[PDB]
Amino acid sequence: DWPTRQVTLVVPFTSGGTTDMLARLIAARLSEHYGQSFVIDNRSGESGNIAASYVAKVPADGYTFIIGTPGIHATNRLVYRTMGYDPATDFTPVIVIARVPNLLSVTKSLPVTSVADLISYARQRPRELFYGVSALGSTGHLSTELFKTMTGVEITAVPYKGSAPMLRDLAEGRVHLTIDNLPASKPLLEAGEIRPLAVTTAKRWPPLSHLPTIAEAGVPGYETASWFTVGAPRGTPTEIVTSLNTTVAAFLGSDSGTVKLREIGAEPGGGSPQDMQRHVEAEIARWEKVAKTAGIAPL
């Protein structure tokens, strides 16, 4: 009979970031399919640790899910000593929603138009400039620290509570540049409020096919990306996980769903619950190496 009443999707960041943008798309589609409201609960704090600690404790009845992030599943262990939950044991996978490029951008008043211009400008002014971090341990955060190690540039991190307040400060010039998820940055690109330099992925993003990759623009072998999930509390009934996976997978694999995701700067995910588990395990192992190379660890 599930669902017989309202379902909550817990989202670990405020609105105007990529996590909430994908959650709203999913919530609308699930609501229509099942005839019950799927509502969003924006529960910010500690790079998603407060949200994840909460969902780890709720009843495993199918009326609460987590919209997971690389932090919650893989990277927060690199910057936080204690987290309030154990991502390996406390959840059961549902599906990977999307794989998403990150984007290097600068504030308009910084007089640089390419990755090579940025590296020169910063090498001339070591330890003077500032960059925006959407959250401690985010793929943006670790992407910039890897870029720093691979190019020799010295620039100072300023953490924020999500992409939304960070990007407001980048538009004002209170930070000079960022690497962060494409969907959140794209409306600012299109309003001309920030200047895009390059994508972080191994291949160009086709709908912005004339922005180069960081690797082709001067940093050989550089590759990073972000991603987003639906997770359930340990013990959620198999029938419920399977139904929810099937419904989301149908949306993501549809022509119309693929178009909707790509228009906002995201590639559809899809696959099985165990495919999500494989992606999480690979990412744990790959980011732990990046963190060591870049000199990042928990205080």
Ligand X SMILES: O=C(O)CCCC(=O)C(=O)O
CB of 276 to ligand X, least distance (A): 16
Binding mask 197-226 toward ligand X (x if CB under 6 A, else -) reads -----------------------------x
Closest to ligand X by CB, 40 vs 116, is 40
Closest to ligand X by CB, 139 vs 245, is 139
* Residue of minimal Cβ distance to ligand X: 17
Among 3, 68, 70, 231, binds ligand X (CB under 6 A): 70
Based on the shown chain and the rule CB under 6 A, indicate whether residue 69 belongs to the binding site for ligand X.
Answer: yes
* Amino acid found at 116: A
Based on the shown chain and the rule CB under 6 A, indicate whether residue 135 belongs to the binding site for ligand X.
Answer: yes
CB 197 within 8 A of CB 118: yes
Q: Which H/E stretch holds residue 93?
A: strand 91-100
- Residue 34 in tokens: 């099942």
Residues 6 or more apart from 236 whose CB is under 8 A from it? 60, 61, 62, 92
Closest to ligand X by CB, 33 vs 99, is 99
Closest to ligand X by CB, 18 vs 245, is 18
CB 199 within 8 A of CB 208: yes
Based on the shown chain and the rule CB under 6 A, indicate whether residue 71 belongs to the binding site for ligand X.
Answer: yes
CB neighbourhood size of 235 (10 A) = 9
- Residue 78 in tokens: 């690199």
**Span of 11-19, 85-93, 115-123, 288-296 interacting with ligand X by CB under 6 A:** 11-19
Q: Which H/E stretch holds residue 209?
A: none
- Residue 80 in tokens: 């936080």
**Span of 32-40, 52-60, 134-142, 192-200 interacting with ligand X by CB under 6 A:** 134-142
CB 91 within 8 A of CB 273: no
Binding site for ligand X (CB under 6 A): 13, 17-19, 69-71, 134-135, 138-140, 162-163, 181, 226
